[PDB]
Amino acid sequence: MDPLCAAPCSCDGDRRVDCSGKGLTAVPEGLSAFTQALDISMNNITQLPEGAFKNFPFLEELQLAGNDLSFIHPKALSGLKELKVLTLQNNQLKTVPSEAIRGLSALQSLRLDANHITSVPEDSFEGLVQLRHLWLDDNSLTEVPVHPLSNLPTLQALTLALNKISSIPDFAFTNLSSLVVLHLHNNKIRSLSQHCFDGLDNLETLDLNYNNLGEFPQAIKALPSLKELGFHSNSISVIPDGAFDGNPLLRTIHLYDNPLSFVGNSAFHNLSDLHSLVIRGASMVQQFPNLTGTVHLESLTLTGTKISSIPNNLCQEQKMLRTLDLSYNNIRDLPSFNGCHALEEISLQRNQIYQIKEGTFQGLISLRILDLASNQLKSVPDGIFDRLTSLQKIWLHTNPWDCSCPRIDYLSRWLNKNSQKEQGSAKCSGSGKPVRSIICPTL
Ligand SMILES: *[C@@H]1O[C@H](CO)[C@@H](O)[C@H](O)[C@H]1NC(C)=O
Ligand SMILES: *[C@@H]1O[C@H](CO)[C@@H](O)[C@H](O)[C@H]1NC(C)=O
Ligand SMILES: *[C@@H]1O[C@H](CO)[C@@H](O)[C@H](O)[C@H]1NC(C)=O
Ligand SMILES: [Cl-]
Ligand SMILES: [Cl-]
């Protein structure tokens, strides 16, 4: 028995009390009023009466998750003027308890997720002059609670994810000037009004994944601080030129699981902080994306297009490239790769490459993986693989290799000496013999 505590709870030396999972039906008695954190989650507190926390006026953290809480008296949380964190997720609240939280003027974090909230009273959040994080995810909201959110200029993170929001009107978040993170994933958003995000000048993260967007949202043009954008698993068919004109600081764009058939040639131009670009199955794309000003790209994947040409300045403009996958397009001519000193992984399988020019592989000192399978290569220049000191694995098979001597001399001898590196077998057109097995006559 702890004299400075109270059974069945547990107390530490820093005024933190753990009374979680003890079958409690009420707020514990016998504890110090100077208690700073109270964890009473995972109990059986189905209701909080008037004066519930009368003995905890100095409380800073309160965890009430995983009870089956369905009612909070308007006066249950009276006196909690030091409360910074309130945790209410995984309960049976049907409405936002606006009355009960009105006097919580020090509150910085409010978790209301995983309840069954269908409505937000128009006066919700009015007293929360310090709120920084608001979780309203995993409920049954059918709209953005516009007027309640107008009360929170200090808010930095908001989630309205896993609800049933179908549209967002003009100026829905306009008072949220401190907002940095906005989650709207797993709703049914089909309509974003032209000015729905106006006022969110500090927003760095927007998550629109798993929605029902068709037209690409022009509304994101009002997001100058945007660094991370997710709109994967929607119904977007085209990413137009100018799409990211308002977002020069974008580092991350998740755009997969969309029926993307076309992307504008300049859609990803002038994005100096963009780290990676992965676009697959945009079948109507014919020209290589204009990436002028997009100089910090470390990874690029472009597959399933009609692209037949790669710009010669690729390894100049995109010098930081570590990973390059341009497989399953229609490429015939390759650029020089000399400027790509950081390139570790290259995939060019299933194109129409018929030649490599001499001395275009000399700068590839970091190259570990080289995939040239399923092309139209009959030959390579002598000493093409000379400078590939980091090379681990190479694919050369499914090419019509001309095994005439002395044309095949270098490659046959290279593949023999470097047999551990070759994956599958480059074979001679006609005879079907492995290229490594050919010994050309010598002087
Ligand atoms: C929770 O409290 C209710 C009402 O007092 C009670 O009927 C129920 O048995 C409790 N649930 C438990 C102990 O799991
Ligand atoms: C929110 O911003 C609008 C438009 O700028 C303004 O009219 C209104 O006063 C603000 N609402 C507040 C501070 O509650
Ligand atoms: C792109 O951005 C850079 C830096 O802000 C600027 O130099 C250029 O004028 C912009 N527009 C272009 C290249 O069309
Ligand atoms: Cl449930
Ligand atoms: Cl990557």
- List domains and CATH numbers for the chain: 1-436 (3.80.10.10)
The b-or-e profile of 173-210 (16+ CB within 10 A means b, else e) is bbbbebbbbbbbbbbebeebbebbbbbbeebbbbbbbb
Looking at residue 17, what DSSP letter applies? Answer: E
CA distances from 277 to 55, 68, 216, 302, 323 (A): 56, 45, 18, 8, 10
Instruction: State the distance from the centre of ligand 2 to the C-alpha of 175, rounded, in angstroms.
Output: 6
Residues with CB under 6 A from ligand 3: 270, 293
Whether cis (ω within 30° of 0) applies to the bond prior to 311 is no
Q: What's the Rg (C-alpha) of the chain? A: 31
φ, ψ of residue 376 to 5 degrees: the values are -120, 25
Q: Do the beta carbons of residue 208 and residue 186 sit within 8 Å?
A: no
315: part of which helix (H) or strand (E)? Answer: helix 314-317
What are 387's two structure tokens? 């400078």
What are 262's two structure tokens? 């076309």
The 3-state DSSP class for residue 440 equals coil
What are 419's two structure tokens? 């047999």
Q: Do the beta carbons of residue 32 and residue 57 sit within 8 Å?
A: no
In sequence order, what are the beta bridge partners of 262? 238
Residue of the CA atom closest to atom 3 of ligand 3: 270
Looking at residue 53, what DSSP letter applies? Answer: T
Instruction: State the distance from the centre of ligand 5 to the C-alpha of 38, rounded, in angstroms.
Output: 44
What are 238's two structure tokens? 């085209």
Which residue has 């000003």 as its token pair?
293
Q: Do the beta carbons of residue 297 and residue 321 sit within 8 Å?
A: yes
Instruction: State the distance from the centre of ligand 4 to the C-alpha of 4, rounded, in angstroms.
Output: 36
The 3-state DSSP class for residue 66 equals coil
Looking at residue 219, what DSSP letter applies? Answer: G
The set of residues, in sequence order, having a beta carbon less than 8 Å from that of 439 and lying 6+ positions away, is 412
The b-or-e profile of 50-72 (16+ CB within 10 A means b, else e) is eebbebbeebbbbbbbbbebeeb
Residue of the CA atom closest to atom 3 of ligand 1: 44
CA distance 48 to 27: 8
Measured over the CA atoms of residue 194, residue 200, residue 203 and residue 205, the dihedral's sign is negative
317: part of which helix (H) or strand (E)? Answer: helix 314-317
**Alpha helices (H) along 351-420:** 409-417
CA distance 307 to 280: 12
Residue type, 251: R
CA distance 57 to 63: 15
Resolution, given in Å to one decimal, reads: 2.2
CA distance 140 to 58: 34
What are 325's two structure tokens? 């996958």
The 3-state DSSP class for residue 434 equals strand
Q: Do the beta carbons of residue 95 and residue 72 sit within 8 Å?
A: no
Q: Do the beta carbons of residue 240 and residue 218 sit within 8 Å?
A: no
What are 24's two structure tokens? 């409690």
Does the CB atom of residue 70 touch ligand 1 within 6 A? no
Instruction: State the distance from the centre of ligand 4 to the C-alpha of 63, rounded, in angstroms.
Output: 18
Residue of the CA atom closest to atom 9 of ligand 1: 44
Q: Do the beta carbons of residue 352 and residue 328 sit within 8 Å?
A: no
Tell me the pairing of strands 157-159 and 47-48.
Answer: unpaired
Does the CB atom of residue 44 touch ligand 1 within 6 A? yes
Does the CB atom of residue 154 touch ligand 2 within 6 A? no
Tell me the pairing of strands 47-48 and 71-72.
Answer: parallel
Solving technique: X-ray
Measured over the CA atoms of residue 96, residue 98, residue 100 and residue 105, the dihedral's sign is positive
Question: What is the three-state SS of 127-194?
Answer: CCCCCCEEECCCCCCCCCCHHHHCCCCCCCEEECCCCCCCEECCCCCCCCCCCCEEECCCCCCCEECC
Instruction: State the distance from the centre of ligand 3 to the C-alpha of 306, rounded, in angstroms.
Output: 28
Q: Do the beta carbons of residue 390 and residue 361 sit within 8 Å?
A: no
Which residue has 């409360």 as its token pair?
83
Looking at residue 254, what DSSP letter applies? Answer: E
Closest ligand 2 atom number to CA of residue 199:
5
Residue type, 55: N
Instruction: State the distance from the centre of ligand 3 to the C-alpha of 270, rounded, in angstroms.
Output: 6
The b-or-e profile of 412-428 (16+ CB within 10 A means b, else e) is bebbeeeeebbeebbbb
